[PDB]
Design a protein around this ligand. Sequence first.
Ligand SMILES: [K+]
Ligand SMILES: [Mg+2]
Ligand SMILES: [Mg+2]
Ligand SMILES: [Mg+2]
Ligand SMILES: [Mg+2]
Length: 83
Amino acid sequence: QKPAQAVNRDVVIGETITVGELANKMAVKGSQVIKAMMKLGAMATINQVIDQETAQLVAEEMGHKVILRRENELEEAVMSDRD
RNA sequence: UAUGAAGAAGGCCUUCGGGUUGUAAAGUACUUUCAGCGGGGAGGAAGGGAGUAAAGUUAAUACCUUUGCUCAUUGACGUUA
Ligand SMILES: [K+]
Ligand SMILES: [Mg+2]
Ligand SMILES: [Mg+2]
Ligand SMILES: [Mg+2]
Ligand SMILES: [Mg+2]
């Protein structure tokens, strides 16, 4: 019952994230390969911090399921209910 | 909820041989309490009103009183329980 499925788990991302937490938040197989993935795509470092849109771009590169959460939703829900 | 050892990745500790997070997760079967969407549906209502009957009262079959029977009705809660 063990297929060869690659990492495809759902991952929630915040507004501003960094490499150190991103290492285990996605749990990708290439522990350093994940680190090189950013350093290759654009100028980036060990401690570099990316944004939620850039984080969505990253998750697209990894291909795992992506979830975007931002704090402004509270205003959006109120706006939606308006008649 | 039951099953679930590739005792998986990733983390951490490592006497780098391993241990642990751990049946935990993933996968495979089973169920829908509550919320959500529709349908149905108690109890809180006792009464009061209109006729009609008989008893009681009187000059009086009237009017009034006591007891029936019959008819239509009384809920903010409330889209109730
Ligand atoms: K391990
Ligand atoms: Mg319900
Ligand atoms: Mg009753
Ligand atoms: Mg009732
Ligand atoms: Mg009498």
